């Protein structure tokens, strides 16, 4: 599924993300835009390592989930394969956990590159939320 910005924004808002760990809704939606272009099937292989990044939040299989050929820490206790599904509840539960690490949202490189430096005050202004 490719979400639209505002549709993603509604889903994340409904699931307690707005302000989650000090990160505003706009920040979370911007991270998804730049990580995966809002696509639940996004998949980015080998990479820097061996590992891969899965789903709308491009969660890596060395740290966050378990994959086929690439063994894992599995901090989200889940098979990477679930993050390629259309439903994003698992992905959200895992992103909630990722951001709890010391690097915060800087775990997501595309957020650091495309969001962190930006004025996002108007990013969700077209949205009916």
PDB file of C-alpha atoms in Angstrom:
ATOM      1  CA  UNK A   1       0.000   0.000   0.000  1.00  0.00           C
ATOM      2  CA  UNK A   2       1.210   3.498  -0.709  1.00  0.00           C
ATOM      3  CA  UNK A   3      -0.236   5.847   1.939  1.00  0.00           C
ATOM      4  CA  UNK A   4      -0.839   9.519   1.204  1.00  0.00           C
ATOM      5  CA  UNK A   5       0.642  11.976   3.647  1.00  0.00           C
ATOM      6  CA  UNK A   6      -2.690  12.919   5.347  1.00  0.00           C
ATOM      7  CA  UNK A   7      -3.915   9.367   5.426  1.00  0.00           C
ATOM      8  CA  UNK A   8      -0.674   8.395   7.142  1.00  0.00           C
ATOM      9  CA  UNK A   9      -0.992  11.314   9.400  1.00  0.00           C
ATOM     10  CA  UNK A  10      -4.471  10.197  10.499  1.00  0.00           C
ATOM     11  CA  UNK A  11      -3.351   6.552  11.139  1.00  0.00           C
ATOM     12  CA  UNK A  12      -0.310   7.649  13.199  1.00  0.00           C
ATOM     13  CA  UNK A  13      -2.331  10.180  15.150  1.00  0.00           C
ATOM     14  CA  UNK A  14      -4.913   7.441  15.916  1.00  0.00           C
ATOM     15  CA  UNK A  15      -2.074   5.225  17.263  1.00  0.00           C
ATOM     16  CA  UNK A  16      -0.628   7.838  19.686  1.00  0.00           C
ATOM     17  CA  UNK A  17       2.329   9.029  17.638  1.00  0.00           C
ATOM     18  CA  UNK A  18       1.754  12.710  17.802  1.00  0.00           C
ATOM     19  CA  UNK A  19       4.423  13.832  20.271  1.00  0.00           C
ATOM     20  CA  UNK A  20       5.499  10.221  20.892  1.00  0.00           C
ATOM     21  CA  UNK A  21       8.766  10.521  22.723  1.00  0.00           C
ATOM     22  CA  UNK A  22       8.842  14.303  22.033  1.00  0.00           C
ATOM     23  CA  UNK A  23       8.538  13.800  18.205  1.00  0.00           C
ATOM     24  CA  UNK A  24       5.685  15.689  16.572  1.00  0.00           C
ATOM     25  CA  UNK A  25       3.304  14.013  14.090  1.00  0.00           C
ATOM     26  CA  UNK A  26       4.847  16.013  11.258  1.00  0.00           C
ATOM     27  CA  UNK A  27       8.220  14.578  12.082  1.00  0.00           C
ATOM     28  CA  UNK A  28       6.950  10.982  11.905  1.00  0.00           C
ATOM     29  CA  UNK A  29       5.170  11.502   8.600  1.00  0.00           C
ATOM     30  CA  UNK A  30       8.205  13.300   7.073  1.00  0.00           C
ATOM     31  CA  UNK A  31      10.366  10.380   8.121  1.00  0.00           C
ATOM     32  CA  UNK A  32       8.045   7.946   6.242  1.00  0.00           C
ATOM     33  CA  UNK A  33       7.963  10.132   3.133  1.00  0.00           C
ATOM     34  CA  UNK A  34      11.684  10.224   2.824  1.00  0.00           C
ATOM     35  CA  UNK A  35      12.384   6.691   4.022  1.00  0.00           C
ATOM     36  CA  UNK A  36      10.001   4.753   1.823  1.00  0.00           C
ATOM     37  CA  UNK A  37       7.904   7.312  -0.151  1.00  0.00           C
ATOM     38  CA  UNK A  38       4.979   6.096   2.065  1.00  0.00           C
ATOM     39  CA  UNK A  39       5.226   2.473   0.601  1.00  0.00           C
ATOM     40  CA  UNK A  40       4.549  -0.516   2.931  1.00  0.00           C
ATOM     41  CA  UNK A  41       6.479  -2.751   0.504  1.00  0.00           C
ATOM     42  CA  UNK A  42       9.610  -0.678   0.323  1.00  0.00           C
ATOM     43  CA  UNK A  43      12.645  -2.913   0.596  1.00  0.00           C
ATOM     44  CA  UNK A  44      16.307  -1.767   0.460  1.00  0.00           C
ATOM     45  CA  UNK A  45      18.992  -4.453   0.364  1.00  0.00           C
ATOM     46  CA  UNK A  46      22.804  -4.776   1.176  1.00  0.00           C
ATOM     47  CA  UNK A  47      23.139  -1.647   2.099  1.00  0.00           C
ATOM     48  CA  UNK A  48      26.216  -1.085   4.303  1.00  0.00           C
ATOM     49  CA  UNK A  49      26.446  -4.718   5.607  1.00  0.00           C
ATOM     50  CA  UNK A  50      24.576  -7.859   4.564  1.00  0.00           C
ATOM     51  CA  UNK A  51      21.196  -6.737   6.224  1.00  0.00           C
ATOM     52  CA  UNK A  52      18.106  -5.006   4.763  1.00  0.00           C
ATOM     53  CA  UNK A  53      15.580  -2.318   5.515  1.00  0.00           C
ATOM     54  CA  UNK A  54      11.871  -3.246   5.363  1.00  0.00           C
ATOM     55  CA  UNK A  55       8.474  -1.432   5.029  1.00  0.00           C
ATOM     56  CA  UNK A  56       7.215   2.108   5.442  1.00  0.00           C
ATOM     57  CA  UNK A  57       9.749   2.948   8.146  1.00  0.00           C
ATOM     58  CA  UNK A  58      12.624   0.942   6.558  1.00  0.00           C
ATOM     59  CA  UNK A  59      13.389  -1.043   9.651  1.00  0.00           C
ATOM     60  CA  UNK A  60      16.756  -2.915   9.465  1.00  0.00           C
ATOM     61  CA  UNK A  61      17.077  -6.690   9.967  1.00  0.00           C
ATOM     62  CA  UNK A  62      20.368  -6.699  11.875  1.00  0.00           C
ATOM     63  CA  UNK A  63      18.800  -4.735  14.764  1.00  0.00           C
ATOM     64  CA  UNK A  64      15.004  -4.659  14.711  1.00  0.00           C
ATOM     65  CA  UNK A  65      13.650  -7.753  13.141  1.00  0.00           C
ATOM     66  CA  UNK A  66      14.676 -11.284  12.027  1.00  0.00           C
ATOM     67  CA  UNK A  67      15.384 -12.187   8.403  1.00  0.00           C
ATOM     68  CA  UNK A  68      16.311 -15.175   6.255  1.00  0.00           C
ATOM     69  CA  UNK A  69      20.050 -15.008   5.540  1.00  0.00           C
ATOM     70  CA  UNK A  70      20.900 -12.064   7.830  1.00  0.00           C
ATOM     71  CA  UNK A  71      20.791 -13.192  11.605  1.00  0.00           C
ATOM     72  CA  UNK A  72      19.492 -10.505  14.155  1.00  0.00           C
ATOM     73  CA  UNK A  73      19.192  -8.688  17.577  1.00  0.00           C
ATOM     74  CA  UNK A  74      15.449  -8.744  16.855  1.00  0.00           C
ATOM     75  CA  UNK A  75      14.573  -5.896  19.339  1.00  0.00           C
ATOM     76  CA  UNK A  76      11.058  -5.731  17.851  1.00  0.00           C
ATOM     77  CA  UNK A  77      10.557  -9.561  18.090  1.00  0.00           C
ATOM     78  CA  UNK A  78       9.194 -10.045  14.734  1.00  0.00           C
ATOM     79  CA  UNK A  79       9.991 -11.454  11.345  1.00  0.00           C
ATOM     80  CA  UNK A  80      10.964  -8.672   8.949  1.00  0.00           C
ATOM     81  CA  UNK A  81       8.504 -10.146   6.499  1.00  0.00           C
ATOM     82  CA  UNK A  82       5.611  -8.652   8.553  1.00  0.00           C
ATOM     83  CA  UNK A  83       6.715  -5.103   7.723  1.00  0.00           C
ATOM     84  CA  UNK A  84       6.005  -5.705   4.041  1.00  0.00           C
ATOM     85  CA  UNK A  85       2.284  -6.158   4.774  1.00  0.00           C
ATOM     86  CA  UNK A  86      -0.319  -3.482   4.109  1.00  0.00           C
ATOM     87  CA  UNK A  87      -1.237  -3.078   7.806  1.00  0.00           C
ATOM     88  CA  UNK A  88       1.280  -0.873   9.666  1.00  0.00           C
ATOM     89  CA  UNK A  89       0.448  -1.554  13.336  1.00  0.00           C
ATOM     90  CA  UNK A  90       3.546  -3.770  13.714  1.00  0.00           C
ATOM     91  CA  UNK A  91       5.738  -1.198  12.012  1.00  0.00           C
ATOM     92  CA  UNK A  92       4.428   1.545  14.394  1.00  0.00           C
ATOM     93  CA  UNK A  93       5.029  -0.633  17.486  1.00  0.00           C
ATOM     94  CA  UNK A  94       8.557  -1.207  16.227  1.00  0.00           C
ATOM     95  CA  UNK A  95       9.232   2.504  15.346  1.00  0.00           C
ATOM     96  CA  UNK A  96       8.035   3.388  18.853  1.00  0.00           C
ATOM     97  CA  UNK A  97      10.768   1.120  20.124  1.00  0.00           C
ATOM     98  CA  UNK A  98      13.475   2.362  17.742  1.00  0.00           C
ATOM     99  CA  UNK A  99      13.061   5.966  18.764  1.00  0.00           C
ATOM    100  CA  UNK A 100      13.670   4.902  22.374  1.00  0.00           C
ATOM    101  CA  UNK A 101      17.313   4.362  21.577  1.00  0.00           C
ATOM    102  CA  UNK A 102      19.866   7.093  22.334  1.00  0.00           C
ATOM    103  CA  UNK A 103      19.969   8.450  18.719  1.00  0.00           C
ATOM    104  CA  UNK A 104      16.181   9.142  18.706  1.00  0.00           C
ATOM    105  CA  UNK A 105      14.811   9.699  15.237  1.00  0.00           C
ATOM    106  CA  UNK A 106      18.426  10.024  13.918  1.00  0.00           C
ATOM    107  CA  UNK A 107      18.218   6.272  13.481  1.00  0.00           C
ATOM    108  CA  UNK A 108      16.430   7.126  10.362  1.00  0.00           C
ATOM    109  CA  UNK A 109      18.967   8.612   7.974  1.00  0.00           C
ATOM    110  CA  UNK A 110      16.420  10.007   5.581  1.00  0.00           C
ATOM    111  CA  UNK A 111      14.754  11.931   8.457  1.00  0.00           C
ATOM    112  CA  UNK A 112      18.203  13.397   9.413  1.00  0.00           C
ATOM    113  CA  UNK A 113      18.727  14.376   5.755  1.00  0.00           C
ATOM    114  CA  UNK A 114      15.171  15.535   4.769  1.00  0.00           C
ATOM    115  CA  UNK A 115      13.279  16.431   7.936  1.00  0.00           C
ATOM    116  CA  UNK A 116      15.440  17.264  10.918  1.00  0.00           C
ATOM    117  CA  UNK A 117      16.718  20.486   9.320  1.00  0.00           C
ATOM    118  CA  UNK A 118      13.332  21.646   8.105  1.00  0.00           C
ATOM    119  CA  UNK A 119      10.581  23.930   9.247  1.00  0.00           C
ATOM    120  CA  UNK A 120       7.679  21.424   9.357  1.00  0.00           C
ATOM    121  CA  UNK A 121       5.113  23.772  10.763  1.00  0.00           C
ATOM    122  CA  UNK A 122       3.079  23.641   7.501  1.00  0.00           C
ATOM    123  CA  UNK A 123       3.871  20.140   6.428  1.00  0.00           C
ATOM    124  CA  UNK A 124       0.496  18.732   7.610  1.00  0.00           C
ATOM    125  CA  UNK A 125      -1.541  21.943   7.001  1.00  0.00           C
ATOM    126  CA  UNK A 126      -3.442  20.451   3.990  1.00  0.00           C
ATOM    127  CA  UNK A 127      -4.513  17.575   6.248  1.00  0.00           C
ATOM    128  CA  UNK A 128      -7.975  17.179   7.790  1.00  0.00           C
ATOM    129  CA  UNK A 129      -7.025  15.529  11.009  1.00  0.00           C
TER     130      UNK A 129
END
